[PDB]
Amino acid sequence: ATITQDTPINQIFTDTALAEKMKTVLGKTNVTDTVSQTDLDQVTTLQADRLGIKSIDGVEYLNNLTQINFSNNQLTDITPLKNLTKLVDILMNNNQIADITPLANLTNLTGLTLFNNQITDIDPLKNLTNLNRLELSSNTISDISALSGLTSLQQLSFGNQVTDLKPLANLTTLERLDISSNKVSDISVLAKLTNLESLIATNNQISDITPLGILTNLDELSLNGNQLKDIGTLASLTNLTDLDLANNQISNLAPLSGLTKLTELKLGANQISNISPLAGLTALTNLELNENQLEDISPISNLKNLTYLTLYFNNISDISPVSSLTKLQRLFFYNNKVSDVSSLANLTNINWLSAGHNQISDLTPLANLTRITQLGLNDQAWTNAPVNYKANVSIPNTVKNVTGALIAPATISDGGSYTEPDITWNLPSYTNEVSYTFSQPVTIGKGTTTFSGTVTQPLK
Amino acid sequence: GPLGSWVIPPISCPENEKGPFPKNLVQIKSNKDKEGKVFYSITGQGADTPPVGVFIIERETGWLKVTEPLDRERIATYTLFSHAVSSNGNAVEDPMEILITVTD
Ligand SMILES: [Ca+2]
Ligand SMILES: [Ca+2]
Ligand SMILES: [Cl-]
Ligand SMILES: [Cl-]
Ligand SMILES: [Cl-]
């Protein structure tokens, strides 16, 4: 492809957006300005991402291009790439591309980014054997046999309908693999990828991770959202620093005890009741333990570097083990059984405090946590010890705001009444319990919430 | 208050990262997912205004991802908003402002 005499730019590049861009690249003032093949031959790279381009008609004339970025456009047909064989890097994510046949003879490509398109057939990739980076996630690929001869691949991502990973067997140069959101259950082929440093495989149907045993260069592993229980194999992976095992069925954490390089550990939504194995993981900065079976969290006090900790949806009554963790900035324990928050006064760096659906009655210990920017104290509940029935039974209100003032009840059951500090009833007949509610907006530092709850008072 | 049932860690991305892209940064979550499916989106410069799509979020999982290598000396910080909606289109949280800091 060569233009023969001087040609308007906007007769070479028919797409309106692309001709404007090329006018700039070629240093012309109007898109009707003339250029010759001389001029087009000088263009060796092109950053034309995010420009609303629908057609790349005309790029075939840019014979000397080595690097292009057409990502974030509206491309469908990419036929004009077919003979640009000096291309070494293509960035073309976030388009509407379905047919990549035009890439089949671009054998000098080392980088091809094609994620978030509508690709199903990657057969045209099979002879692109110099590829070291290939991104193909957010597509609808089911069959990766075309990848089997890409033995220089270092970084690789694909999706979203793949079951069979057998084609990866000879890709032993692989260092970083992302197979998230496919249909994968069998990762036995991954055993052959001994140079793997990072494996991201979230949201599959993996239950057997024994293939990971000899992948000892792994430093990042994500298996969020699979069907793991037995994680014994992980004790081999002593170079791990970032491990995500959330949304699984794990209970025994002993295999993690020696992974002392770990700085991030996600274990939310599992079956954990014993966190003694984590007590030696003192480099941890982020730990997620939400949606487990925890009561005794005393071994968390060892984790002095934590800045982010989740504990929401467990059965925790004693929060005081976190009170040692002075670097903490965000702490989440919604839906537990905590009443005494006094130990939290020691968390002087805290910015997010999420403590709804506990048994918190008294905010005074929190009063000096003025770095707070987000706060949650909604929907506390507790049941007082029984008191003796009397027709005129009365109890003190115990709900205290951060200022120390009692919060007047919002509602009181059975027509009862408040005169600070006492709630008083007038019961004609015996009743099994009475109750009251409170609801009070409050701000500590900059964080704002409604401190609310329901207090139940059983009567003897 | 604004916290609502958001659960979000601080977000930091080194510049000049290696692929494959898109790369997970953090998983944004609302605990409102305990009473029905929640669908996530983001807005702001770098998400839905220029430069569009540097940051994206997977609408069903809440995974916030970066789609390309960053350059701290070009733009060191981005301000995004996370949104959470029900199947029926209704907001189940107030938009949360998220700082993304680009590091060394
Ligand atoms: Ca959850
Ligand atoms: Ca830089
Ligand atoms: Cl350019
Ligand atoms: Cl989780
Ligand atoms: Cl909360």
Side-chain angles (χ1 to χ4, degrees):
Chain A
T2 49
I3 59 172
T4 38
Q5 313 183 333
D6 278 60
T7 306
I9 281 172
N10 80 336
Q11 287 173 209
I12 300 168
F13 306 93
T14 64
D15 181 274
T16 286
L18 184 50
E20 159 75 42
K21 161 73 170 171
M22 286 316 295
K23 155 200 102 192
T24 307
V25 174
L26 295 162
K28 299 291 165 142
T29 135
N30 309 109
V31 295
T32 42
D33 283 25
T34 198
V35 280
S36 278
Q37 196 52 46
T38 40
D39 303 15
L40 302 182
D41 288 340
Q42 304 305 326
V43 184
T44 64
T45 69
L46 182 59
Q47 263 278 133
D49 51 301
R50 303 175 164 80
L51 290 179
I53 303 177
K54 308 186 252 280
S55 183
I56 50 171
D57 289 12
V59 177
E60 70 268 34
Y61 290 112
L62 306 176
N63 299 317
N64 290 329
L65 284 176
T66 65
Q67 180 256 312
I68 60 162
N69 192 340
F70 284 99
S71 71
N72 301 276
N73 275 309
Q74 298 159 57
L75 301 188
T76 45
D77 157 20
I78 63 175
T79 297
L81 296 194
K82 183 179 171 251
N83 296 119
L84 302 178
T85 59
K86 304 180 186 208
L87 282 173
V88 156
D89 208 85
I90 294 175
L91 259 13
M92 225 165 20
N93 50 294
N94 211 301
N95 280 293
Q96 293 174 309
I97 292 162
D99 184 351
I100 58 146
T101 302
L103 317 171
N105 287 305
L106 302 192
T107 51
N108 293 308
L109 287 167
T110 54
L112 181 58
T113 296
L114 283 173
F115 65 85
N116 192 6
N117 275 291
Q118 297 169 36
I119 294 157
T120 289
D121 181 36
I122 58 162
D123 190 72
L125 305 187
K126 70 184 176 292
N127 296 319
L128 305 184
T129 61
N130 292 310
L131 280 178
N132 51 244
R133 184 195 75 248
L134 183 58
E135 303 134 303
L136 291 160
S137 72
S138 300
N139 278 292
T140 52
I141 299 156
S142 63
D143 172 11
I144 53 158
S145 58
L147 311 184
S148 65
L150 316 185
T151 48
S152 295
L153 279 181
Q154 285 179 271
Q155 296 168 12
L156 178 58
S157 194
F158 54 74
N160 73 342
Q161 301 291 324
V162 173
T163 62
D164 176 21
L165 304 181
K166 282 168 235 278
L168 303 185
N170 298 321
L171 315 188
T172 55
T173 50
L174 281 171
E175 284 175 355
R176 307 179 71 79
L177 180 67
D178 186 347
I179 60 169
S180 308
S181 303
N182 279 290
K183 315 303 221 175
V184 173
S185 63
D186 181 359
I187 57 154
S188 56
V189 79
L190 304 187
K192 296 181 184 35
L193 276 9
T194 49
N195 295 307
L196 269 189
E197 294 177 9
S198 176
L199 173 68
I200 312 284
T202 72
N203 300 290
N204 283 288
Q205 303 102 75
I206 301 150
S207 59
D208 165 27
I209 55 159
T210 57
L212 304 181
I214 68 173
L215 267 35
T216 46
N217 305 300
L218 276 174
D219 68 59
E220 173 186 36
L221 176 60
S222 183
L223 291 163
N224 196 310
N226 279 289
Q227 293 150 39
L228 305 176
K229 179 159 274 292
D230 179 10
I231 54 153
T233 293
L234 301 181
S236 298
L237 305 187
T238 52
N239 292 309
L240 284 168
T241 68
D242 181 355
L243 177 53
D244 182 340
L245 301 168
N247 301 294
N248 279 294
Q249 294 171 210
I250 292 154
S251 60
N252 178 12
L253 299 180
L256 305 181
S257 59
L259 302 187
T260 52
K261 291 201 201 195
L262 284 174
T263 57
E264 301 192 37
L265 177 57
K266 296 172 67 179
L267 288 171
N270 274 295
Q271 289 172 35
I272 300 157
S273 63
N274 169 27
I275 55 153
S276 281
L278 308 185
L281 303 189
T282 48
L284 285 173
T285 61
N286 288 51
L287 178 59
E288 292 182 23
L289 284 166
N290 49 288
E291 297 168 278
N292 275 295
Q293 280 165 222
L294 297 167
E295 175 175 52
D296 176 3
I297 62 175
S298 61
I300 233 143
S301 67
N302 295 291
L303 308 183
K304 303 297 185 167
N305 288 319
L306 288 180
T307 53
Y308 182 82
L309 177 60
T310 59
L311 295 171
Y312 59 89
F313 276 93
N314 281 289
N315 193 38
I316 301 164
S317 296
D318 182 7
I319 202 54
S320 74
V322 312
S323 80
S324 12
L325 307 182
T326 67
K327 310 203 196 164
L328 272 174
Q329 309 184 76
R330 302 186 183 191
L331 173 59
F332 302 78
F333 65 97
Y334 178 94
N335 208 310
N336 279 288
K337 300 182 165 145
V338 174
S339 58
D340 183 357
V341 292
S342 65
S343 71
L344 299 191
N346 302 307
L347 303 186
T348 57
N349 293 310
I350 197 84
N351 306 312
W352 290 40
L353 181 56
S354 175
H357 210 310
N358 281 263
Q359 310 188 165
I360 301 164
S361 68
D362 179 0
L363 305 186
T364 49
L366 302 182
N368 298 331
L369 305 172
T370 53
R371 287 218 160 77
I372 285 171
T373 61
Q374 302 299 335
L375 180 64
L377 299 165
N378 294 183
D379 308 321
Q380 309 302 323
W382 62 93
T383 293
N384 293 334
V387 294
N388 281 308
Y389 174 84
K390 286 185 153 77
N392 316 105
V393 64
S394 168
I395 66 168
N397 173 20
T398 58
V399 186
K400 216 175 265 205
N401 207 353
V402 68
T403 58
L406 297 165
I407 292 165
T411 71
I412 303 168
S413 80
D414 301 294
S417 62
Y418 181 63
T419 301
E420 177 185 23
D422 301 305
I423 303 173
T424 305
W425 287 271
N426 196 345
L427 305 164
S429 228
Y430 174 91
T431 188
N432 73 303
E433 60 182 37
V434 286
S435 65
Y436 65 92
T437 72
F438 61 95
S439 184
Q440 174 63 68
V442 59
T443 285
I444 303 185
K446 297 176 198 180
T448 299
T449 188
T450 298
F451 175 41
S452 72
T454 301
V455 184
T456 297
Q457 184 49 94
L459 305 178
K460 282 181 62 104
Chain B
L3 173 59
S5 305
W6 285 116
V7 181
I8 308 175
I11 310 182
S12 70
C13 190
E15 62 175 335
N16 304 326
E17 288 270 74
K18 275 142 130 199
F21 290 93
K23 181 69 172 147
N24 286 337
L25 296 185
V26 304
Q27 182 160 28
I28 285 183
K29 274 171 260 228
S30 165
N31 277 335
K32 289 291 197 165
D33 65 26
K34 294 291 196 183
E35 49 231 41
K37 255 300 299 165
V38 175
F39 298 91
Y40 303 97
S41 61
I42 53 177
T43 56
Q45 277 182 73
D48 76 338
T49 58
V52 303
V54 169
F55 298 101
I56 67 177
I57 195 160
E58 191 170 17
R59 61 178 251 115
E60 290 194 47
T61 62
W63 275 111
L64 181 65
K65 304 161 180 284
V66 62
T67 67
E68 55 181 61
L70 303 181
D71 187 345
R72 165 164 58 148
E73 287 83 31
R74 297 277 267 268
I75 301 163
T77 178
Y78 300 83
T79 293
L80 306 187
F81 293 83
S82 56
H83 307 270
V85 298
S86 67
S87 222
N88 294 319
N90 309 300
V92 304
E93 300 284 1
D94 292 302
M96 177 68 77
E97 179 171 333
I98 276 143
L99 220 211
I100 302 185
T101 294
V102 191
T103 58
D104 354 290

